[PDB]
From a paper:
GRs mediate chemosensation by forming ligand-gated cation channels. However, some GRs do form functional homomeric channels, including D. melanogaster Gr43a and its Bombyx mori ortholog (Bm)Gr9, which are selectively activated by fructose. BmGr9 is a C4-symmetric tetramer with the ion pore on the central 4-fold axis. As anticipated from its homology to ORs, each BmGr9 subunit contains an N-terminal intracellular S0 helix and seven transmembrane helices (S1 to S7), with S7 broken into S7a and S7b.
BmGr9 purified in the presence of d-fructose yielded a 3.98-Å map, which we used to model the fructose-bound conformation. At the bottom of this pocket, the fructose-bound map contains additional density when compared to the agonist-free map. While the map resolution is not high enough to resolve the fructose binding pose, the location is consistent with published mutational analysis. We are therefore confident in assigning the bottom of the pocket as the fructose-binding site and discuss it as such below, although we refrain from describing specific fructose-protein interactions. In both a superposition of the agonist-free and fructose-bound BmGr9 subunit structures and an alignment-free distance difference matrix, we observe agonist-induced movements of helices S2–S6 that reshape the binding pocket. S2—with its highly conserved D99 residue closest to the fructose density—moves the most, and most helices move inward toward the central axis of the subunit. Immediately below F444 near the extracellular pore opening, Q443 points away from the pore in agonist-free BmGr9 but rotates into the ion pathway in fructose-bound BmGr9. The Q443 side chains thus create a hydrophilic ring more suitable for cation conduction in the fructose-bound structure, although the pore diameter is largely unchanged. In addition to its twisting along the helix axis, S7b moves out from the tetramer center by ~4 Å. As a result, the pore widens the most at the other hydrophobic constriction: the Cα-to-Cα distance between opposing I440 residues increases from 9.6 to 11.8 Å and the pore diameter from 2.5 to 3.2 Å.
Numbering used by the authors:
A (entry chain A), B (entry chain D), C (entry chain C), D (entry chain B): 16 to 230, 283 to 446
């Protein structure tokens, strides 16, 4: 297949991250894309090594006494730190170990999306992807800064206790697994949002049909037809993406619920003791901010897609009300008016949950319960 | 745009409340309405000042010892009082700081609503708004009385402890923020309910089409068409209002859940100690009544709108069953019978929750859990 | 209006119960029915008196010491007994004080139901009501027996402690309020289930249209039309009943959730002490059975109505698949196939909850939480 | 009726398990099937005997002191062991005591399924059932191994304490009831999944209609009709199966929620004491795995059926978009496009819950609450 503009860049990031084993060749505005068996094998080696190192680190930190373990001063702290580490190793594992199938899925649907773009204004439509890439890359940079600053803070806790080398080798795996699960989450928030921008362009191309019939190189008598076919393809591609991501997309939500449990637990315990550990207190608040912003980066592209859905259901009904009775346009709008009832576009990871924003009301409805219930066992 | 009747009065209230930066000019039954940049800047100054004063008050009350702090006798009381104050400052802030965009939204949809009223019986239709205004203003008067009586009670607690000036300056901000969030909530319960009354008038204008065809200046062959167009416009306007309010409409619900947690906590603790503080006990019960009545003033206009929805789905199906087969009326009723399946009228703030009355079953399903869980940490 | 068969008997029960202020005159198989202002005033007097007596009883039992109060041995026992009494006084009050409007609703919809029965097999269709009455009356008899046996047990606790007269006058009101709320709940479970039996008869009258067209005094070309009109009327009547009952129908569910909290609390505390109070232990288990069976008598007629709904959606689609293309029957089946998408028949009290059986999964999902949370405060 | 291929084998298992009282006669690839009154009476005797023996065992283990009761060392352990046993006796009872009606249901729907298969590729379609049987039998073998290993472990606990005969006779009933409820659950996961495979074959037979019209012994003008009739029959059969299983299908889910409460309770208590009981610790973890895998064997065939549903709604809309306007194929696709809106295929046991995979999010949302709440009462 062919990738045009910044989608090539976000995939290049996922490739060096081992989340997209793609080999590609340059073009004047594009890259031709292929799977490499070697890059798959490299990615499996890399993440298997980093998962082994992360588990070996967790085992070492469980073995070292609570006296020396600068964030694991008690059994309960060991339990919550194990929760912090382990589900991120789960998300990293189940994410990358599916990566070849996810890229088979992308190499399937992207040909259809290119065929759709060939009618829906592909000309300069890449500027939308350029803007979305420029916006989204800044999130990964911000997280990289925060992760490094976290490791530097714990490295200072190690240095002030004389244990730098061991606390380094115990966590350098875990931090890189965090970075990998961030790259997976951003890659989802890119693909599902470029598809949303294409839906927006389709929707405006339909909207101007309303003015064309009230008063675009073919009459609405044909244009509504060909747009309804594109409105089929731009559903099938959404169900492709929702399936190819559905497993890590739900695992990362479960891991983020667990982190929104574990991080406030630390914040509260570390302000029940004397607040003198100011750097820790701030770093944990910035982590709580990241553990919310990541969830908002998961759910926002879905809500902004389903709003394009609802606005298409609006503008079709406007057009259907203006269109003259019984003429061919009326029948083709009938076709579209049923299509919008059958092919409802919506992400749902493994079908396990409706990924619209009510998911945040549900997840916070769990977080606020479980945080308090868990704290109650500390005292 | 133009505002006729008491909608001008409720907007005038919101204007002096700094929730609607509208400049308007009088007419024999109406006002012409415009945004003023000066009234925007004034509103931003006013609410920024009152939020600064409210935070400065909360900081002062946290600084003053629990001995002298007549409702903050312990750390837990300080925590729950901070919850009481702060989310009301959040609602006031996020409410007013969006006000110019909300009035841009109103100045958009109200022209379409005036165009709809030009066909749906705008003649004397203002009496519905007059009645709704007369009913709703009494709620704001009642709340103003309750708020003043609360401040007078705490001022008496201050006077009997010799601390009147400090307890005054610590809370005069907070009370005015409460008043502002009440004005925002009432303004929603006006706009979303005037739109409901217009839906009712549309629905009756359709209902009498059933008698007209069984036996309104044009045949049903045209009237059902033009009504179906109005039935599009009276959906688009609902999605405009639901979006322009959606953010403060959900923040105020979250704040009201938090108050239905905090206020019963006070009531229970202040009846676990000796009930001699009769004025406090009554005032807190009246606050619990207000914290329920406000939520009912949020949800009731939605439920009474969706009941007009359901009754329109009923009466259309009556009309469709009587209408003769294959004649033009049958096709136009087909159009309407699909429109009612696509353009389902319903509020949903930011889409985050279905604002129908099942929301109260959900929110009380949370309140009764969290109140008990929180009390359990006191003892 | 006119009431035929056992519906007259169940209304006669509700009339002597003061839940249906109907004056009626006999016919050879029917009664003519009217509202009496005198029977309304009598019912308001009766329930106002019994609510005053029940509150006066609760006040007396709160005044008498826990030593003598044979089921109120502690403050917590007083709190849960107050919960037991008070929401039943709420249900009795809000039930009966709406009774005239509920009978206005019945005197409205029953004329339409008689008009429907005039086509859908009203001839001997009363035998369904006869069977349903015979079944449902046995539930009220069983509850009357259980209530009397409860009062006799507590009267024996009073006699063995020498306090019979006071414990009698403290509870004789409460028991009669329980009986009134049982009569209200049964009356709902009669009306909503006779309407279900009429839906079943309609559905079979449609089903045999499938054989008539595959091979009922008019061709399917007309019969499906007239049945679709009846299928409108048998929705409008359901929305009438669901609204006229919706308030006490939801209050009684909330009261039954509260009783499924309070009664197991007694059962557990009274088996944490020595089980020697065998009669009490059995009587409380029989009460827990009644507090489940009442909820099942509320929800079952709804689930058995919506199953007739779903089976009508099935059999219409069978008929639509056999019917020949383009002939008039195809258009009339199109009409019906949309009607089944718009006029979905379902009860919902005040819209506050979907009264289908998932309600029991939701309510038990609350009961099992709140029972344990409440017990945790006892020790 | 007639059963072809491995469905005969899974029914033969259920017959020796007393869950399917079928008498059958062999054919070259099939068996003719009948109910036997004798096999019904035998099954009622067998399960009544084993329920009596299981209750007698539970009573004996409650009678024997906590000193000797190798998994019932305290009252709380007796309570949770009673929960472990009793709801499995409930599931076994309510399962088998309905078995004749369930086989009446099967002997009804299987004739229609054979009639459908006569058009949808029944030729070699049995290989799908062969594969599904080969896969599913391995689950019952695995569970049999685990159950035997559990009984052998407890028999060793008995032998090392000299009490082998009594601990044998106290549990040999319970284990066989576990095996019976496993056979019931697998039988559901066979029937509901063979029906899914038939839906898949139907769906592909429709899909190739898209290529046939773009370019199967009759034109799409007929084929889409006859397929839409089969698409009715393959809904009616699903509602038959969902009803005939709905009661034990929901009871077994409730029992599995209760086991996911009770088993982690043991695991946690038996790791709060010293872990030396390694065999117990492993066996309880393998039980927790089984208590998850059983629930996944319940829900997975539903989710994989509703995905065939959604993919049929997709491919119909593809076909409807290609089909030429106004020709007969367009009307027959209109028929199908409404049928997919009315006859939505989905299991729901007793309607009490949507059995799609969101059920696992709901049930784990309960499990994680109730496990912690219950543990909190231990200490
Ligand atoms: C941005 C705020 C988003 C909250 C919007 C209002 C929530 C509506 C609601 O009432 O949902 C509740 C969410 O629980 C909750 O309060 C948890 C949400 C946070 C509010 C309560 C804790 C205070 C937060 C500071 C409970 O519902 P579910 O049991 O189904 O989960
Ligand atoms: C006016 C009363 C409105 C209540 C109507 C019956 C509630 C139906 C229900 O069963 O919903 C329950 C609401 O919880 C609840 O009892 C909380 C609602 C209040 C009832 C329980 C506390 C006693 C109130 C005095 C739980 O459901 P969700 O977990 O989804 O939230
Ligand atoms: C007849 C039994 C009916 C139960 C059917 C299975 C329940 C399905 C389920 O998982 O729903 C759960 C119901 O809670 C529950 O266990 C409470 C239902 C009772 C089961 C748990 C306690 C043991 C009962 C003895 C939780 O869901 P919601 O939070 O939305 O309320
Ligand atoms: C495979 C993991 C499946 C979990 C998928 C994410 C769950 C989405 C969610 O947020 O649902 C929550 C499920 O509760 C829950 O965390 C319980 C699910 C397990 C996650 C929390 C405990 C840690 C598990 C180790 C709460 O919702 P409901 O109150 O309606 O029930």
């Amino acid at each position: 297949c062919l990738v045009g503009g910044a989608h090539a860049f976000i995939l290049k990031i996922s490739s060096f991250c081992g989340l997209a084993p793609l080999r590609f060749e340059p073009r004047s505005q594009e890259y031709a894309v292929t799977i490499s068996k070697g890059k798959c094998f490299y990615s499996y080696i890399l993440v298997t090594f980093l998962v082994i190192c992360t588990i070996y680190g967790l085992v070492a930190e469980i073995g070292v006494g609570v006296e020396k373990s600068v964030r694991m001063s008690s059994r309960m702290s060991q339990v919550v730190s194990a929760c912090d580490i382990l589900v991120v190793a789960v998300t990293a594992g189940v994410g990358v170990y599916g990566a070849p199938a996810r890229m088979r899925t992308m190499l399937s649907y992207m040909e259809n999306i290119v065929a759709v773009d060939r009618e829906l204004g592909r000309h300069h439509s890449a500027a939308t992807e350029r803007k979305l890439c420029a916006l989204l890359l800044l999130i990964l940079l911000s997280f990289t800064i925060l992760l490094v600053d976290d490791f530097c803070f714990y490295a200072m806790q190690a240095g002030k206790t004389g244990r730098q080398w061991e606390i380094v080798t115990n966590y350098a795996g875990f931090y890189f697994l965090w970075y990998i699960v961030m790259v997976l989450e951003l890659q989802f928030a890119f693909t599902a949002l470029s598809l949303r921008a294409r839906l927006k362009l389709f929707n405006e191309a339909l909207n101007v049909t309303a003015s064309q019939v009230c008063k675009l190189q073919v009459p609405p008598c044909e244009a509504v037809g060909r747009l309804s076919r594109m409105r089929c393809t731009l559903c099938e591609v959404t169900r492709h993406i929702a399936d190819g991501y559905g497993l890590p997309l739900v695992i990362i939500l479960m891991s983020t619920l667990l982190h929104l449990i574990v991080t406030p637990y630390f914040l509260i315990m570390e302000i029940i003791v004397s607040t003198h550990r100011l750097h820790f207190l701030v770093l944990q608040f910035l982590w709580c901010t990241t553990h919310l912003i990541r969830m908002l980066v998961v759910v926002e592209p879905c809500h902004y897609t389903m709003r394009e859905g609802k606005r298409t259901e609006d503008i079709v009904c406007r057009l259907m009300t203006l269109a003259p009775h019984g003429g061919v346009l009326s029948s083709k709008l009938e076709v579209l008016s049923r299509l919008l009832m059958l092919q409802n576009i919506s992400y749902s990871p493994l079908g396990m949950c409706t990924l619209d924003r009510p998911l945040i009301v549900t997840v916070l409805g769990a977080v606020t319960t479980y945080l308090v219930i868990l704290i109650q066992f500390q005292r």
